[PDB]
Write a protein that binds this ligand. Structure first.
Ligand SMILES: C[C@H](O)[C@H](O)C1=Nc2c(nc(N)[nH]c2=O)NC1
Ligand SMILES: C[C@H](O)[C@H](O)C1=Nc2c(nc(N)[nH]c2=O)NC1
Ligand SMILES: C[C@H](O)[C@H](O)C1=Nc2c(nc(N)[nH]c2=O)NC1
Ligand SMILES: C[C@H](O)[C@H](O)C1=Nc2c(nc(N)[nH]c2=O)NC1
Ligand SMILES: C[C@H](O)[C@H](O)C1=Nc2c(nc(N)[nH]c2=O)NC1
Ligand SMILES: C[C@H](O)[C@H](O)C1=Nc2c(nc(N)[nH]c2=O)NC1
Ligand SMILES: C[C@H](O)[C@H](O)C1=Nc2c(nc(N)[nH]c2=O)NC1
Ligand SMILES: C[C@H](O)[C@H](O)C1=Nc2c(nc(N)[nH]c2=O)NC1
Ligand SMILES: C[C@H](O)[C@H](O)C1=Nc2c(nc(N)[nH]c2=O)NC1
Ligand SMILES: [Zn+2]
Ligand SMILES: [Zn+2]
Ligand SMILES: [Zn+2]
Ligand SMILES: [Zn+2]
Ligand SMILES: [Zn+2]
Ligand SMILES: [Zn+2]
Ligand SMILES: [Zn+2]
Ligand SMILES: [Zn+2]
Ligand SMILES: [Zn+2]
Lengths: 81, 155, 81, 81, 81, 81, 155, 155, 155, 155, 155, 155, 155, 155
């Protein structure tokens, strides 16, 4: 039900992360997400090359809606239910 | 390959307009050949190891560059010896390098050795052909308190 | 459906950004947005000279409503659905 | 419709800003706002000497309601519709 | 109607502030608030020794409900209407 | 009624804290929480090894719903009612 | 144009109340003419290049000013040589400048050469007619961790 | 007013128990009078101008105080010359001052000259009767990245 | 009380196995008595006053400790003289102290004198029986830009 | 155990190819035995105590390492003496250590002695077989203003 | 002669391939003409006066050189003011010089002013086209105690 | 004599207008008595031993003075250990001294221990009630090469 | 001879176990060949010229060494330009040298150019395979006042 | 003899009250045995070679001491390599020494290698159980100009 997407401080430009290691591989397939391990990180993640507002238009068509947007550090996180 | 180098340095001494058979240039093809083989013989808390002396060879002009490496890391389960961090330095520095790859290679060697929380590698060096290169991996990149703790203690 | 506008830390004074490279050119035309590439940035953006509260009065008349306001860095971002 | 008020990090103590150069002079008159240009700033602003919670009690009686409170820097901003 | 409570960055541990100089002395009496002037501050304040989640359970029984939680600095502020 | 969970700045990876010293030991038992005293802290806390989005899926099945997500420091806090 | 400069310096020596034909001022119109032609002959990690020596000419009083340029950048796909960053310096410094345009011009030349994530250019210099000018472009302006990593390593 | 000062210094020399007519105190009322008239004769990037030498007169004890002014600003449309910032210094310093008003006056003179984004003025000085006073106006007060860029480069 | 001290120092000289009647210890009970009476004779911008010399007496071992006090404050309506901040120092330092109370006492004396926005007091000192104690009151504690402006200028 | 050490050092002097009965090696098994027993004889404001001299023994190569400990803490109810913090140092340093455990042990001893708000321990040391290790506990880890106040005052 | 200089600098701006009619080069022939007129406007105990700031013009390349003069002398009957020694500096430095003649000229001006026992003049300076020149006259040359007293106190 | 000192310090605490029975002055007569017993517990090549730390008591005002001793000597037949030269320091410094006698006493103790060619003793110290005293005995006084070899190496 | 060097560096890259055809070693035989041709392209008062930067090639190991030359001389009739002393440096340094011959060669070139009273040449340099070599000719060797005047001013 | 040392270090670990079979003391008898075998593995112009790093073992307490050797000499017919002077250092330093014999031994090794005019050896070192020892042989002892030329250039 919950889905946390995030970007950096300029939300005009991507990448926007879309999931973690146990995220839904059908919904990541519709968003067009690749899966990488960035260097120094000890975990896998999904990510797309789009801005976050394009992804918020995509996730709206799959029955999600933004509860709360907030900013932590240089990161800006959206919570969708 | 030691006679193959020494014949290549004797052709350097002749090409420069210099007399390779004089007082002072008799062992020069052989002293310099064993110099280039030495110079390329590499092929919950924060632990900052600074002032690590480095002596690498530029791969563009084959002339040395001289500097210091600053390494800090946050361990998870496995820590690394303070004499083993310096041999990771000497393996990648005693090669034909650029400073930009030499920074990134040291951070990857410590990352795969320990899988730590974060790695910070800072190489300042003077190119005789200072420049600071700096990789910040892990939680040295995401946290402002952790990057700034590294950058005050190394100086 | 979603639209992310942002300003700096004094929200009494502008500029307030209103869109990215693929934003709606009719709605940017009503807001009065110019399109620039600031130096050092590798992307285009829309922007107006107004404070953000004037733009929030404009976007209200076009059927938007603020979901969530949040602050990330020195930036203050509004999300409108 | 929208109205952005702000204070500093101790919200027990004021001043709380209430408007910009083009804010409603009737509603600023009811809140008791003075209008100053602080030194180094290139704009005018309205401000009261009260804490923000007193002003949120005043603005409630004039048909406003807090959408979202957020903090940007040392500033804490309330959005009222 | 509005009531702003705040804590520091570890919300597992208190103190949580509950009011300013002109806050309701009956409602501060039910929360168990003491009133101090901390050194260097030029104002009085109410405070309890509890975590913020215990106080949010208390204020729920007196007809309040959290509008918005946000974080400004090391502080985390709840707004209750 | 209220329940405050928190993680660090990469919300793809845990741990996510779930409670304080007086939290419900039945609900902490369903989430799989251990209880530790980290060094330098003068308080106990509950915590799980999961990402926060997995825990938000768990708490949804026990009749909770996210009011507000916000970020304070490097921490990202969810409030569930 | 070298005789056109040397005739213009011989008229300077006469206008100052000085004797242009004495012991010590014979080659002075011609030594100084070849001086002004030399002085205007220009027309995932962080790479900070510091201590870049600069010697520019003030365009107001035609008297030199002497300083240092500090450059750091975050590459995207294309990195730049450490000897090419210094020739970008010498092209824009060996001109008739102000320090404020000389800072902004160096940042634009590196921005268009590489299209990096961010550029930071800091020029301190002493005007004989210190002042620090500083452009922060890209993600050296938006990120506080990235600007502060630059500003600690350059010192 | 130069004979009016010199008669006032000759009454100082008599009141101290000192002989105003001796070897060494003949031009002393007149050398010191022309000293007090000299000492009161004043009545997109960041540009930091540091090490600005200051010599002001304390208005309480009429004894000098000696210091340095650090000025930085972010222009909007209009920049100011680096020799004009120093004459703004000399107009307000060569007066009867306190350090606290001398800081605030320099920031206001630059604010009205240019209307910039922000102004930072830091005066450290030794009072012979160090203390640092510091005005941060504009976006040097609201931004933490902008205040901290100023405070690292001035040292 | 000056003969009462001098009789107490003459009993010290006898208890140490030392001869109080020799060449060099005749005025020693009386020179040291007038030493201990001197050593205990105390009973919109930022203004940082640093390098304030301090000489206090430890109240545990009655042996001096020597240090520096750094004071900065943000006034509201009332400012304080730069010679009065130093006499607030000398009143609380020339006592029998600990460094921890001496820091807190100076901050309270400035807080009640002016009611400012914030007070920062930093005392470093060497105990002969360095340690830094630091009170941050007001908006030097709540603001990160204000505490960090204080801590860079004092050094 | 002092004759048991001295017999073990006399077997060292023989194994090195050295003559244990000569001018200069007569008391050497006994002077060095009493050396190794000395070297292992350990078995609301911020208070930073810096420059704490440390002399520990490496437990890998049995050769000393020499450094400095920096301790700062924020008390709650109970403060600790400035001579007791140094004896907590000497108990854990005069042992067979590593620097990484020696940092963590000092922070735990102060944590259990006082239960403070936060503890910061920084040990820099030169291993003769500099490296900085750093524990940040309590509110020195969660607050950026508190960690950065510690890290500027210790230098 | 001020229009005669300004016409000679406008011919310099044209000969360098530069546009003399643009934003930034309108007052440049006239600002630089009044610069070159300022830069050439000069046409029983030991008293060492050091740190005398000097700013002279090279007569070969017409480019400044910047240095310090150290003067010491042993008077016989007549001493010289400490502000008059500096105006003897400014008369001979604000000319078209070499450092070697500028040293010898200062020593001769003090020698004829006072007829002292000895004169020592030391000029160190950086030529932008350090070098130390040193005249030792009188009893600064014959006595080893007198030359060495001069050379230790100037540093 | 330890109760005889502690009764003499309790009469000091009463004579100063201070309350000897409060929080902080209970063990003060006894902590200070064991302080004054510690502070007075002393009753062919050139070998320079420098940086010898000294902590003596002034015999006039009974207040410490803190300094460094520099010792160099030229042996004849008998050399002295580098740890024995420091215990000769601690015997004469941990007394009630003047700096002038403390210099002369150290030179005499080394002179009688070894009978060397020459002795040089230099004590610099800060009196809290720097001064350099210096004895040059033997061939450190007669030879200029030997005194000047000592005085360059100690710094 | 430039293709003869470049073929000799391509045989060096193969002999070291390195791949001469990769990203980063394509122009390396030709960039390094034009490096070794640059590095060997050299084939009454006291005037001290110090801080003369030197960059020579060791003739034993063909690896650079980096240093400073200090030259002082006492002219008789003929003085030498301060830019000609530096080209005498660059002719003898940009060769295959030892530091000991490089010192002696510079002194002989100045001796024959001018026939002065005395010549002093001091070369300090760091050999990457500091050492000070020093020739004192003429009256820098016979006079103690003249050698010591040289040796104080160069530092 | 490597098992004979390792059995002697295992008896040291037991005699200190320490557990030789734990996490951290398994290879400690064998890592320290190969440490003590490394630490004792040694059994017309002026050429000053300074900053020669030294690491010797005290023969009294078997604990290292760390220092620098300064060597200068005046050759007659035979000069010595700058890498051979350092191996003469490492042969006599990597032994069980005193500093006084280590100075005299280095001077004798250079004296017999070359038979020069004079030898000067200066060893400063810190004993962990600074001291300067200094031999001046030949014409470094008889000439005051030659000893003082050595002593200014080494610093
Ligand atoms: C999350 C955080 O970055 C990490 O857990 C830690 N950071 C730090 C640490 N220790 C220090 N000294 N500094 C840190 O920033 N220990 C743990
Ligand atoms: C987004 C961020 O600014 C950027 O991706 C990076 N920043 C940094 C980096 N590397 C360093 N050392 N420092 C940074 O700030 N690599 C990547
Ligand atoms: C908004 C911001 O404060 C302002 O636009 C700028 N700040 C900065 C700047 N340039 C520098 N170097 N530093 C700043 O902080 N240019 C623009
Ligand atoms: C709110 C804020 O802390 C306060 O108003 C001010 N802070 C500062 C100030 N001036 C300076 N220099 N620095 C501050 O942090 N003036 C006002
Ligand atoms: C919450 C906060 O970390 C803590 O209460 C305090 N911090 C500080 C303090 N005092 C100083 N100097 N610095 C702090 O960071 N006193 C209290
Ligand atoms: C003869 C001698 O040079 C001359 O008389 C003096 N020399 C000196 C002096 N005073 C000082 N300080 N130094 C001298 O060398 N006074 C007199
Ligand atoms: C006679 C002379 O003073 C004496 O014999 C020596 N002097 C010296 C010496 N050694 C040094 N280093 N310096 C001297 O001055 N050894 C012997
Ligand atoms: C004889 C003597 O060495 C020679 O005539 C001179 N020496 C010196 C000199 N000038 C200086 N500064 N120093 C000397 O030693 N001029 C002349
Ligand atoms: C006799 C004299 O000591 C000896 O001939 C030399 N001394 C010196 C020299 N060279 C220098 N630099 N210094 C001397 O003292 N060469 C020769
Ligand atoms: Zn190269
Ligand atoms: Zn100019
Ligand atoms: Zn005054
Ligand atoms: Zn004490
Ligand atoms: Zn070891
Ligand atoms: Zn010139
Ligand atoms: Zn005294
Ligand atoms: Zn070599
Ligand atoms: Zn020893």
């Amino acid at each position: 039900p919950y889905l946390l997407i995030s970007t950096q401080i300029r939300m005009e430009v991507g990448p926007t992360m879309v999931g973690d290691e146990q995220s839904d591989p059908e919904l990541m397939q519709h968003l067009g997400a690749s899966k990488r391990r960035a260097l120094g990180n000890n975990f896998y993640e999904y990510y797309v090359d789009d801005p976050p507002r394009i992804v918020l238009d995509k996730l709206e068509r799959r029955g999600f809606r933004v509860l709360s947007m907030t900013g932590v550090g240089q990161t800006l996180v959206w919570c969708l239910h | 390959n030691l006679p193959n180098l020494a014949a290549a340095y004797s052709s350097i001494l002749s090409s420069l307009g210099e007399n390779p058979q004089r007082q002072g240039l008799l062992k020069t093809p052989w002293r310099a050949a064993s110099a280039m083989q030495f110079f390329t013989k590499g092929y919950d808390e924060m632990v900052i190891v600074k002032d690590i002396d480095m002596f690498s060879m530029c791969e563009h002009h084959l002339v040395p560059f001289v500097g210091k490496v600053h390494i800090g890391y946050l361990p998870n389960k496995q820590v690394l010896g303070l004499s083993k961090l310096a041999r990771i330095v000497e393996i990648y520095s005693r090669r034909l390098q650029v400073q930009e790859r030499l920074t990134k290679q040291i951070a990857v060697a410590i990352t795969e050795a320990l899988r730590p929380a974060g790695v910070g590698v800072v190489v300042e060096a003077t190119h005789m052909c200072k420049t600071v290169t700096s990789t910040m991996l892990g939680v040295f990149r995401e946290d402002p308190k952790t990057r700034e703790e590294f950058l005050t203690l190394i100086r």
